[PDB]
């Protein structure tokens, strides 16, 4: 009864950051040191906990959030950060207890003509609350005039495309990101380590 971390990290296709995918993990045992000592992850940063202690800890639930961004935006997936990804796509709480794992996926998520299947939100009136999700595509109204659902002056499409190319720089290459949140409620902790 191993925790199904394999189908989260080794998934064939990944979600867009504006429509990030959440998977709940419970009722299983998980070996976190194998995570920290495999796949040569580019970034592996834990807040409020350490992987060695995580291997001897128990939690009520574990949420794994998966998406794809560019490398230069990976630092936005962290508590107290600002920017397009942090503000309008995926926001972490200031009290975030959990880990953030990111690895380069140029060989998977890049195409010679440009991979435009990955989108990020560029326009939003207010910053997202922590763990809030917005997959709406309503035309952003920048002026006082109504937009009526058509692109035009003061009427922008909210989403923008990365257009990943293999020849791009590392900071502009596709990185796959998995965020592990550890929820500990007043319930029996069903997901633990060895």
């Amino acid at each position, epitope marked *: 009864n191993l925790c199904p971390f394999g189908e989260v990290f080794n998934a064939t296709r990944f979600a867009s950051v504006y429509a990030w995918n959440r998977k709940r993990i419970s009722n299983c045992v998980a070996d976190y040191s194998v995570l920290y000592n495999s796949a040569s992850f580019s970034t592996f940063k834990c807040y409020g906990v350490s992987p060695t202690k995580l291997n001897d800890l128990c939690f009520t639930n574990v949420y794994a959030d998966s998406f794809v961004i*560019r490398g*230069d*935006e990976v630092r936005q997936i962290a508590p107290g950060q*600002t*920017g*397009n990804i942090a*503000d*309008y796509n995926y926001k972490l709480p200031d009290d975030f207890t959990g880990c953030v794992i990111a690895w380069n996926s140029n060989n998977l998520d890049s195409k010679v003509g440009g991979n435009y299947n990955y989108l990020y939100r*560029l*326009f*939003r*009136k*207010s*910053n997202l609350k922590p763990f809030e999700r917005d997959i709406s595509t309503e035309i*952003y*109204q*920048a*002026g*006082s005039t109504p937009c009526n659902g058509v692109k035009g002056f*003061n009427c*922008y499409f909210p989403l*923008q495309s990365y*257009g990943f*190319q293999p*020849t*791009y*720089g590392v*900071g*502009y290459q596709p990185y796959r990101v998995v965020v592990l949140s550890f929820e500990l409620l007043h319930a029996p902790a069903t997901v633990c380590g060895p």
Partner: antibody
Amino acid sequence: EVQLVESGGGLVQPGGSLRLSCAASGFTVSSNYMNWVRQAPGKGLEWVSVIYSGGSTYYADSVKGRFTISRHNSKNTLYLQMNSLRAEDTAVYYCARGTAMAYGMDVWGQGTTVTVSS
Amino acid sequence: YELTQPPSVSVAPGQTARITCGGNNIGGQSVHWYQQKPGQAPVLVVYDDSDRPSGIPERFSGSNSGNTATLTISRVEAGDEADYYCQVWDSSSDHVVFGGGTKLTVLG
């Protein structure tokens, strides 16, 4: 009717303070990317600051810790407070709308001059 | 981050002028070209590397190849004499980076 009108520039002694105002017509400042961009006399354009629609702010290294971008929705006006001024800040300051990530900066102000000299 | 532009480009009236902009990550970035006539404020003449803003003459075209962005002005008239700047948003330093500026002078 789509215009940006700047004001508040002038002569300031080194180490002084000065506030620049940019009144907008034709779009809403609070829901737009708004930039302050300066240009020293004879030199090229230098980006100074940007404010996001959600409130996040970014500043250039040259003005970090001294300048502050802000907005007032009641007057639909962008503001740039500038403290601890030095001679190198002597420039014409424009306000503009847009983000360099997409669609660029389309509407620009006429610019106001700021001279820091004793 | 640095955007590299030739300081000067000179072209006779009616000929075609090309202004280049080089950067390490320009291929992944959206390049915007602005024109500033002497004494006036900058005006946006190219956005998203190839898109013409409303009101800009069709002779102003944006091109992107590899890590070089080229602003091409066809059938150059004397009124186009101005300083042209390429601009991107660099996410390696969270900055809006401007090119050095190119002085397009129509040869008379």
